């Protein structure tokens, strides 16, 4: 067997141009190939401009449309994702001009608001600045945007470690069982900063003859890396909606929070279908950033 | 003399509870003893929960922090390991929820990536699921994660046998002198599967007035067993870095691959020291798994 690694690690230097250029060219082809017989000239013109940009600057920037295409193809290329059948249903927020953690936070608020949509969940991805030399990475340290803390256990037992990290970073732990962990955000390679998510941004389905059980509506992956044309985006949170004695199906449907039931299955595929008139791009796992981060202040 | 065996063999049944419980209790004590006067109540509470878990399930699970502690104490307890002086410098990857060989492979890729760190080597251990009844063991059949094949001789003369085994398993032997052997991975007691290591994951120091000599940067023991509190982890690869007419010291230092020179000696001990504000646990040798494995398909 010759499987590839599903993980893409840190760098300490820019991608060598001799490595980057072939990848850039291949993606450009894939992109312009999505127009079949049309646009031969734009294709070649783009090849020339990208090549020059790389030779001049050591890298290149994607057009907005190229980025949108990339995020959708990466989704289409996600082997385990059930949602990828309707891969055209994806809203893209372009945050590649982001520079600070405060700005990252505002972008994520915007994302959570749009995708939550008061229960009528919409898929979205927010793309932060691409890796340059690898010493200025933007990363979200959370595994998901919204997750309950973990503290025997109290809360989300799978975040006991991350919860402890937040505390160590100055987060004040309320010790409930449904404490929404803060966003831990790294901009430009700096030490991460801690941001409470505004409670009003977090939609929860309350389960329904008293246990006080509830769960958050928005499942959002915070910690993967988008690869495209040799470029790496170490910060690119995205979300879908849930797949699904189970008062869940009932509580979600009764509170009208989207889940992947047959109706939603048919509808989303219907909408996807109406949007018509080594794998790359790809979402990679990363090494947990607290295991690799060099603190400029601990 | 009353030396103990440094080898821990296979089982065909779960550890008897009457054997397991005393060992579990002893480790819990060792763990909570590392807090001196504090935490008497957590200690007793943990004793009670572990005892109940064993009586209920026939075994028990370590907390993440208990596991981390165990791996570091086992290292501290390794008589021949020079690196154990700086035993607090160890990154632990928890793969105890692993179930398939493909998953094992992804964990090992992640390990190789982190520990290699583009030449700035970091110590790490990846811990796979603990032995249950002994008929579902996870094992790596390699002695190291990265090793050259052996084929008079061609390649690593010490792997002639293992190389032959890989071939017998379906591996196609390129007949060079520096062929990186594939990972041979056994999950849940199943027959092993063969996985080429992605070449880009393998860092090599090229020796430097033409012989074409090179060697791999990452020394990683693949085949030992971690014992702790009566639990056995037959799959727990770990790595350090090398100790060191010798163009080696030069080639490694000049290509900035870590070795245990005086500088690295002082630095790593310095970092270890800043991490402050029958032996058990222990790493055992095992019997070569191809000598004991019952093929459900040959
Ligand atoms: C529209 C609703 C969506 C549904 C129902 C859905 C469902 C799933 C499910 C069930 C998994 C597997 C979880 C596991 O194995 O533990 C998954 C994985 C994943 N999803 Fe989604 N997803 C959706 C939207 C998205 C979006 C918008 C993206 C990206 C733009 C995406 C990217 C991925 C990726 C990369 C993985 C990992 C896939 C792999 O490793 O093979 N998903 N998704
Ligand atoms: C940080 C760099 C490290 C260095 C320089 C180092 C060096 C060594 C050396 C020189 C040996 C003896 C080899 C021989 O006799 O053929 C050894 C053995 C060993 N090392 Fe390391 N090591 C390091 C990290 C580790 C780590 C991370 C672990 C485990 C978490 C570890 C566990 C062991 C074990 C169990 C043995 C066998 C010891 C025995 O049988 O007495 N080493 N190491
Ligand atoms: C879109 C969103 N996702 C995920 C979101 C959140 C994820 O977190 C995992 C760990 C916490 C519990 N999560 C439960 C879950 C299960 C199935 C599912 C989820 C979340 O979102 C889409 O479909 C799984 C995993 C995957 C995948 N695509
Ligand atoms: C960490 C890593 N190790 C080892 C890694 C690899 C090992 O393989 C042996 C057989 C192949 C050649 N190896 C050479 C060697 C020598 C000294 C050393 C090595 C490898 O890694 C740490 O220090 C020894 C043995 C021990 C021990 N601690």
Swiss-Prot record, chains A, B:
Q: State where the protein is found.
A: Cytoplasm, Cytosol
Main localization category: cytoplasm
Q: In which tissues is it expressed?
A: Macrophages.
Its Gene Ontology cellular component terms are: cortical cytoskeleton; cytoplasm; cytosol; perinuclear region of cytoplasm; peroxisome
Q: Which GO terms describe its biological process?
A: arginine catabolic process; cellular response to cytokine stimulus; cellular response to lipopolysaccharide; cellular response to type II interferon; cellular response to xenobiotic stimulus; circadian rhythm; defense response to bacterium; Fc-gamma receptor signaling pathway involved in phagocytosis
Q: What are the alphabetically sorted keywords of the record? A: Calmodulin-binding, Cytoplasm, FAD, Flavoprotein, FMN, Heme, Iron, Metal-binding, NADP, Oxidoreductase, Phosphoprotein, Ubl conjugation, Zinc
Q: What does this protein do?
A: Produces nitric oxide (NO) which is a messenger molecule with diverse functions throughout the body. In macrophages, NO mediates tumoricidal and bactericidal actions. Also has nitrosylase activity and mediates cysteine S-nitrosylation of cytoplasmic target proteins such PTGS2/COX2. As component of the iNOS-S100A8/9 transnitrosylase complex involved in the selective inflammatory stimulus-dependent S-nitrosylation of GAPDH implicated in regulation of the GAIT complex activity and probably multiple targets including ANXA5, EZR, MSN and VIM.
What name is this protein filed under? Nitric oxide synthase, inducible
Q: Which organism is it from?
A: Mus musculus (Mouse)
Q: Which gene encodes it?
A: Nos2
